[PDB]
Write a protein that binds this ligand. Sequence first.
Ligand code: NA
Length: 256
Amino acid sequence: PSKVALSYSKSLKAPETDSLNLPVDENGYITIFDGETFNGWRGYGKDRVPTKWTIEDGCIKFNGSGGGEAQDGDGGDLIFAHKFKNFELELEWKVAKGSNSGILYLAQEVTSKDKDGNDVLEPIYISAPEYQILDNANHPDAKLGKDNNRQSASLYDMIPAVPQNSKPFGEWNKAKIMVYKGTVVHGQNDENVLEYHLWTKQWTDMLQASKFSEDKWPLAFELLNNCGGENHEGFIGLQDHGDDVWFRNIRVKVLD
Ligand code: NA
């Protein structure tokens, strides 16, 4: 019955002035999804959970209509609205045949001004590194990128999961994402599959060879190159990429 108070925010860029008492296990993992509600969770940029995210059989499901990045209907990415800094997330994930999703971490909610001075919501992924979720056997993204760097558990389009030990579609996979003092490790199915380091020259060089380079996408470069912003922190998010996917046993340990 041990529990810990985690702060959360309820709307775009809001301060985390509310709180949830969540279970914490014997090793410090706080269960952030309760199996039954979206308490603490909301749409990236919204004050409401988009109804394409549902809850069934103890899992968060996305209900995709097949438009990839479109984020059409009552969609968009989903965040657990508590900023983490040094943390280790563990979860299980399952893809339908041919499905694409992702885990986003260190996400900031970012707006730009258009030519009229209105605020425009920028994509979660121009600030947040992404752990790819994919059916590697059927989604064509599996064959794009370089060295299989768009297969499940890759840092999408930058560093491939090696080993690529995904189970086939319809089976539960385990994911781990660890961020500790700038060292990031992805795990998949109880193995560490890649490692990298934020805020270094080599990270800069990696971004300069990406679709988020300073030349191609200045805002993305600025945000990602100082990932997590001034305080190096941000939201865990789940990706709307138009496809059916399920997540469960979502747990985060705060690291010191
Ligand atoms: Na994805």
